[PDB]
Amino acid sequence: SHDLPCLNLEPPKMLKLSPLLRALQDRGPIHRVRTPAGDEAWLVTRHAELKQLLHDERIGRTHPDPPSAAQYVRSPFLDLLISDADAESGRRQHAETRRLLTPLFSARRVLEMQPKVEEAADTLLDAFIAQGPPGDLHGELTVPFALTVLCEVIGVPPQRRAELTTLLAGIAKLDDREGAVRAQDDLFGYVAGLVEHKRAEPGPDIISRLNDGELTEDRVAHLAMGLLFAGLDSVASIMDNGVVLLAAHPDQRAAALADPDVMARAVEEVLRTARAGGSVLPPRYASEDMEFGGVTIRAGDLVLFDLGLPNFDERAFTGPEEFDAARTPNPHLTFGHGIWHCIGAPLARLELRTMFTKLFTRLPELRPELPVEQLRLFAELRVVW
């Protein structure tokens, strides 16, 4: 019957939404679309409306029949995110997780993380530079940096790190529902052991602090594993894309390097411009019928949160296709918003400001080996300097 527009997985161009996504954003704030998996979904295309939906408690992770729930992509890994719970349960669990995690990232606490973040970048950059160019910025710097910072902050003693790495590759390579339940189970038991160690021997770290709050071992282990998933690929991929963006815009890179305040804004601009559409948060579903934006979203419908659409909405940014390291203000939604806002954001900002500063201070000429066109077609990111 339908002729819904069909979204696809083609990599976006640098600083430009795809023709189809510009046409949708142009046409209206909200549309019925077909996802790359072939299911129906609502795509919200504009900054104001997405922001408002991100605060709407009628959208969440529960679905009464998860196996027939619409999906953006088939992914055994993301399937485990879809709660079977009643909607109210889902909301309470979510609010309680936010209550438990938010104190861990207070101003004072993130200040206390900063010297480990500085130290980890110096150590890893020292090693990456010693190996000489060309090097794989992804596999040899940005991923290890993000993971090291996570170890330091969550409380993974150095001796246990080799196994963590391995269990994490072991969830990265997974590809069926059995293998993905099993890989989760192994990581979980590993993490429960970390929790028991820290009960015996507290540190100034997330696991000890959650222990202190009289949470049971399962609950601490679940929170710690969630933090591992939230803080790893996200950081590495914004960092990778930032190096590409900053290498490609020499005068702004120079302005960012001359003034830490410009560097702070440059980080915000990398966050805004790292992906120009096509990356969608994990699935989220209306838990009850809702009128929104001219349509009726039905209980159980898939609603897509593509944060790159708002980030390139000319209604929210002047000249959205321009990389402006000094853009101010910069209300990007790369950390989500409302009920879905990144609790690690202050830490993520710190990792990005620290690594862009040290990379481009020590290696002023650093750039990708391939030109952007070829790069677009990261598993690896080879750079020279």
Contacts of 224 (CB under 8 A, 6+ apart): 154, 191, 194, 195, 206, 207, 210
Q: Please check if 31 is assigned to a binding site.
A: no
Q: Breaks in the chain follow which residues, C to N over 2.5 Å?
A: 377
Amino acid at 125: L
330 near ligand HEM, judged by CB under 6 A: no
101 near ligand HEM, judged by CB under 6 A: yes
Minimum CB distance to ligand HEM, residue 281 (Å): 4
Single out the residue of 230, 254, 255, 370 in contact with ligand HEM (rule: CB under 6 A): 230
36 near ligand HEM, judged by CB under 6 A: no
Minimum CB distance to ligand HEM, residue 371 (Å): 26
| Cβ–Cβ < 8 Å for 376, 14 | yes
- Judged by CB under 6 A, the number of residues near ligand HEM is 19
Gap between the Cα atoms of 321 and 323, Å rounded: 7
Q: Which stretch binds ligand HEM (CB under 6 A): 32-40, 294-302, 311-319, 339-347?
A: 339-347
Gap between the Cα atoms of 96 and 93, Å rounded: 5
Amino acid at 180: A
335 near ligand HEM, judged by CB under 6 A: yes
30 near ligand HEM, judged by CB under 6 A: no
Query: Per CB under 6 A, which of residues 110..139 are in contact with ligand HEM?
Result: none
Contacts of 290 (CB under 8 A, 6+ apart): 56, 58, 59, 296, 297
346 near ligand HEM, judged by CB under 6 A: no
114 vs 296 by CB, closer to ligand HEM: 114
Gap between the Cα atoms of 174 and 177, Å rounded: 9
- Cα atoms found within 13 Å of the Cα of residue 284, Cβ hemisphere only: 22
78 near ligand HEM, judged by CB under 6 A: no
290 near ligand HEM, judged by CB under 6 A: no
| Cβ–Cβ < 8 Å for 72, 280 | yes
Q: Which stretch binds ligand HEM (CB under 6 A): 30-38, 69-77, 334-342, 364-372?
A: 334-342
Closest CA to 150 of 117, 198, 173: 117
Determine the 3-state secondary structure of 33 from DSSP: strand
Minimum CB distance to ligand HEM, residue 144 (Å): 14
Annotation: binding site for heme b: 61, 94, 98, 284, 342
| Interaction site with ligand HEM (CB under 6 A) | 98, 101, 227, 230-231, 234-235, 238, 281-282, 334-336, 340, 342-344, 347-348
